[PDB]
Design a protein around this ligand. Structure first.
Ligand SMILES: NC(=O)C1=CN([C@@H]2O[C@H](COP(=O)(O)OP(=O)(O)OC[C@H]3O[C@@H](n4cnc5c(N)ncnc54)[C@H](OP(=O)(O)O)[C@@H]3O)[C@@H](O)[C@H]2O)C=CC1
Length: 425
């Protein structure tokens, strides 16, 4: 049975300062630096002394990555990371989405899994740090929650819960459908689904390999049987000149892009300790910079569909960059909807039937309570997510909680999944 889940936030039921010898990294603003008496910086810290805590001010995943490299191999107290505009609590005073800040949370969750005894947590604060905000943070740093937000002086804690699955009509995309990563595994399944519907004029499969991609010839032949024209174009989704050229040429033909499905991306297994800034950027490029470029160049679309991952929802060891990029996608969908435009980001669990996952990957996933979604089930859930009468960003995965939770929490407890614990209501 296909699991549908969503992020939600629980309002929790405060100090004037934070005692001790703290190390402040990244950009900690003056209204927070003043909570600490004589705090250390990266420059002033004598690495032989263990600070009582670390506070990292991060605007993007790279900032948190840099801070974690600074403290690697040195004893410190808990490492806490503060952001702003990184999460949407669902209150009236929620700020507008900051795509790059959201990446901090994707990476930070992975830090919790890789460095379970060292990682403190994430706190999202309002942009303007008033006295109420100062006190909420101080109480948090002085006092098991590790994914927190401050809104109107109150603390909220992040949770993952079930939602209802949308019950919708049929997805019938029209005109030109652009599928980035379209010659890949999931891209190909989506391409065939679109073709089968018989609603579109043109299906464009975009990837760096284009028509030179393995399997592309057979994929295109199969699509071309159904009525729409189809082509594979060899284009880097991060290349502004190439992307703008393609989009402009289609509009000039009277066949402008009307739907985007963004499945371009890469996945690597590299611990934070082994991930440099350049590699982090390479890991995030197609997924994040591609999506941002698409959003910019295509303000008027019927649909803008981002293929995200459970990695950006709850994290996995070795997936810092992958998780960060996926968290960015979820934020971009929120941002685009705030601008009055259609967008959905579906945070998928593993799929069966090819792509990123090898036969062996699939068997290890099942071990930790993740069963690959069958392709028909996944595609149906995709249609449901797109055609939903209400905006949301769904998490869609086949999770067996009795196996998943003990594996996920083996090295570190997780209040995120409270609703799946023994006797949870
Ligand atoms: N398989 C799964 O279980 C899961 C997949 N996802 C997401 O689905 C998407 C596709 O996954 P999947 O089909 O498995 O993976 P694939 O590797 O099969 O497909 C990825 C595609 O992205 C393309 N790509 C990578 N970089 C660029 C770039 N700079 N410009 C244009 N295209 C690029 C690749 O082609 P090329 O190298 O030719 O450029 C390839 O076609 C990914 O974004 C992934 O994160 C999410 C959750 C689960």
């Amino acid at each position: 049975r296909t699991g549908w889940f969503s992020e939600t936030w629980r309002q929790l039921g405060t100090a004037d300062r934070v005692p001790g010898n703290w190390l402040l990294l990244g950009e900690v603003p003056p209204a927070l630096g003043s909570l600490f008496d004589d705090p250390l910086t990266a420059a002033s810290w004598d690495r032989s002394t263990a600070p009582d805590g670390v506070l990292v001010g991060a605007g993007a995943a790279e900032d948190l990555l840099a801070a974690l490299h600074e403290v690697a191999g040195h004893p410190t107290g808990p490492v806490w990371c503060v952001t702003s505009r990184a999460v949407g609590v669902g209150t009236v005073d929620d700020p507008a989405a900051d795509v790059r800040a959201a990446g901090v949370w994707g990476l930070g969750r992975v830090a919790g899994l890789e460095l379970p005894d060292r990682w403190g947590g994430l706190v999202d604060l309002p942009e303007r740090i008033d006295d109420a905000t100062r006190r909420a943070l101080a109480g948090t740093l002085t006092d098991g929650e590790d994914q927190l937000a401050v809104r109107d002086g109150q603390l909220w804690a992040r949770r993952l819960v079930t939602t209802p699955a949308p019950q919708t009509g049929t997805w019938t995309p029209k005109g030109t459908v652009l599928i980035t990563g379209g010659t890949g595994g999931l891209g190909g399944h989506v391409a065939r689904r679109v073709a089968e519907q018989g609603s579109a004029d043109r299906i464009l499969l975009l990837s760096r390999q284009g028509s030179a991609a393995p399997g592309a010839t057979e994929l295109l032949e199969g699509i071309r049987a159904f009525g729409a024209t189809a082509e594979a174009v060899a284009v880097d989704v991060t290349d502004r000149a190439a992307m703008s050229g393609l989009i402009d040429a289609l509009a000039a033909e009277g066949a402008p892009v009307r739907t985007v499905v963004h499945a371009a991306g890469v996945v690597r297994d590299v611990r934070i300790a082994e991930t440099g800034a350049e590699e982090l950027a390479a890991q995030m490029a197609a997924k994040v910079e591609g999506a941002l470029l698409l959003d910019e160049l295509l303000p008027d679309l019927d649909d803008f569909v981002l293929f995200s991952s459970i990695s950006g929802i709850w994290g996995a060891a070795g997936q810092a960059g992958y998780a960060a990029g996926n968290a960015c996608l979820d934020a971009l969908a929120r941002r685009r909807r705030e601008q009055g435009k259609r967008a959905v980001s579906v945070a998928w669990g593993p799929w069966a039937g090819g792509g990123m996952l090898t036969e062996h990957d699939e068997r290890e996933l099942r071990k930790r309570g993740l069963t690959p979604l069958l392709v028909p089930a996944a595609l149906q859930a995709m249609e449901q997510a797109i055609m939903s009468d209400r905006a949301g960003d769904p998490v869609v995965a086949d999770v067996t909680w009795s196996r998943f939770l003990p594996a996920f929490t083996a090295s570190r407890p997780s209040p995120l999944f409270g609703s799946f614990e023994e006797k949870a209501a």
